[PDB]
Amino acid sequence: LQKLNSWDVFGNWFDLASWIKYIQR
Amino acid sequence: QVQLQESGPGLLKPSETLSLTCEVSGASISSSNWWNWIRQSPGKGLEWIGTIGGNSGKIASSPSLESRVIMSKDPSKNRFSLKMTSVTAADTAIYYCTRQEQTLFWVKRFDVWGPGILVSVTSAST
Amino acid sequence: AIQMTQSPSSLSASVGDRVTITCRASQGISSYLAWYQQRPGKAPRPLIDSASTLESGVPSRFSGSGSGTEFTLTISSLQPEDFAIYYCQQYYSDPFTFGPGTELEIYRTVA
């Protein structure tokens, strides 16, 4: 099944949400 | 020196919903950390329930409680929270908030714990 | 999930004895194994991580070893304050699982 993997953890090095908001502005 | 402090009410009614919040006092919620909640009952034992990533916001729970557990994080107030529904009294336990540092590709131990919060589900006093 | 087991669930010794808890896992979880000490009342305290690397503030007498299925926590000389409950926990994969716990007490007891 779909579990917590290293791609997820490696992704936790970046805060994409905050900067996607910078884009929506 | 990261310091975790649980909050929320320890007075609950059966088949309902509790809400706990962990104030972080050493690092930003929106960091390369993983904010976890841990459950400890004498018979049910020390059980991991949930986690959320400070940056990615990716959420993960225990197969048993994923169906009735919810994770959240408020960086503006530098806290993270969890809320479990259908609160059978068997869930009555101590709830700690912990965190995991991480390497490039995986998590680490629970290096820091909160004091623990005693939330009981019953219509009586203690 | 990953079945985490621990032996013995109970054990009694006295100051000066080399005691050893053992921790077993369903699968080969490499070195992703940590040990916590919980003196009842307060919250768990991490002692070992990566199976054989001890946290800050951990006395040197404590030791860990293992790299796969079965690991060992090893106190090289018991102390008045080591009489706590010891949990082993894997973080190799989720759901993250703990062991049953291992009790450690003193002598001269009503039994």
CATH number of the domain encompassing residue C80: 2.60.40.10
What gap in Å lies between CA C107 and CA A10, rounded to an integer? 49
List beta partners, residue C22.
Answer: C7, C72
Residue type, B56: S
- Domain span holding position C60: 4-98
Is residue B126 assigned to a domain? no
Where residue B34 sits, what CATH number does that domain have?
2.60.40.10
Is the separation of the CB atoms in B50 and B62 below 8 Å? yes
List beta partners, residue B41.
Answer: B45
Is residue B94 assigned to a domain? yes
Helix (H, G, I), strand (E, B) or coil at C44: coil
Q: How many domains does chain C have?
A: 1
Is residue B125 assigned to a domain? no
Is the separation of the CB atoms in C54 and C48 below 8 Å? yes
Inspect the interface and report whether the beta carbons of B114 and C43 lie closer than 8 Å.
Answer: yes
What gap in Å lies between CA C37 and CA C47, rounded to an integer? 7
Helix (H, G, I), strand (E, B) or coil at C45: strand
Long-range contacts of A16-24 (CB under 8 A, 24+ apart): A16/B55, A16/B56, A17/B57, A18/B30
**Residue written as tokens 């919620």?**
B29
**Torsions phi, psi for A11 (to 5 deg):** -70, -25
Is the separation of the CB atoms in C103 and C9 below 8 Å? yes
Inspect the interface and report whether the beta carbons of C34 and B110 lie closer than 8 Å.
Answer: yes
Q: Is C43 on the interface with B (CB under 8 A)?
A: yes
Our CA-based measurement puts residue C95 at a distance from the nearest CA of chain A, in whole angstroms, of 8
In angstroms and rounded to an integer, the radius of gyration of the C-alpha atoms of chain C is 13
CB nearest to C95's CB, from B63, B100, B116? B63
Cα dihedral B70→B22→B97→B65 (10° resolution)? -10
Is the separation of the CB atoms in B35 and B96 below 8 Å? no
Q: Is A3 on the interface with C (CB under 8 A)?
A: yes
Question: Resolution of the experimental model in angstroms, please?
Answer: 3.0
Give the method of determination.
X-ray
Is residue B123 assigned to a domain? no
Q: How far is CA A7 from the centre of its chain?
A: 10
